[PDB]
Write a protein that binds this ligand. Sequence first.
Ligand SMILES: *[C@H]1O[C@H](CO[C@]2(C(=O)O)C[C@H](O)[C@@H](NC(C)=O)[C@H]([C@H](O)[C@H](O)CO)O2)[C@@H](O)[C@H](O[C@@H]2O[C@H](CO)[C@H](O)[C@H](O)[C@H]2O)[C@H]1NC(C)=O
Length: 144
Amino acid sequence: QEAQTELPQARISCPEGTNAYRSYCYYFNEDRETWVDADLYCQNMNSGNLVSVLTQAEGAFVASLIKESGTDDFNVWIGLHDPKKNRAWHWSSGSLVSYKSWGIGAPSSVNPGYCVSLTSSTGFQKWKDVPCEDKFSFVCKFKN
Ligand SMILES: *[C@H]1O[C@H](CO[C@]2(C(=O)O)C[C@H](O)[C@@H](NC(C)=O)[C@H]([C@H](O)[C@H](O)CO)O2)[C@@H](O)[C@H](O[C@@H]2O[C@H](CO)[C@H](O)[C@H](O)[C@H]2O)[C@H]1NC(C)=O
């Protein structure tokens, strides 16, 4: 019951290079890393995770962020994976799966991938399952 005052601007605005959407900060990193190594990068900077896409509007924001970067990349990592290889999907942040956006023929049963990327052919709006050892660029999400 000491400092009962209003939030400073650092808790309402996101830092240079990152963009705000509904109380979180987001950024696209063009470094090509495995899914696990990408999630670790996100954890190391302001205690985030690979992005979790929980609504259609959040998916539209993330797609716009990637397009605005000017990247020529085909695949971008998001935080969804199948850890027990039994087609039960989880977000690395622990959030519930409240939204899905699978592309045509996904998730595959005939040549299954266990990690998920956004595809450039769909304007970064639809998802594909791919091997977790692939090296792709990625989007991080962190609270602030
Ligand atoms: C809210 O502000 C607390 C500091 O407040 C003054 C101060 O005494 O320094 C209150 C003054 O009215 C104000 N003066 C003017 C003219 O605005 C100043 C200035 O706003 C400030 O100097 C910037 O120039 O602030 C701030 O430190 C407090 O923080 C927290 O304090 C708690 C401790 O009791 C606990 O440590 C919190 O975890 C910590 O964030 C600020 N509150 C929040 C939620 O950020």
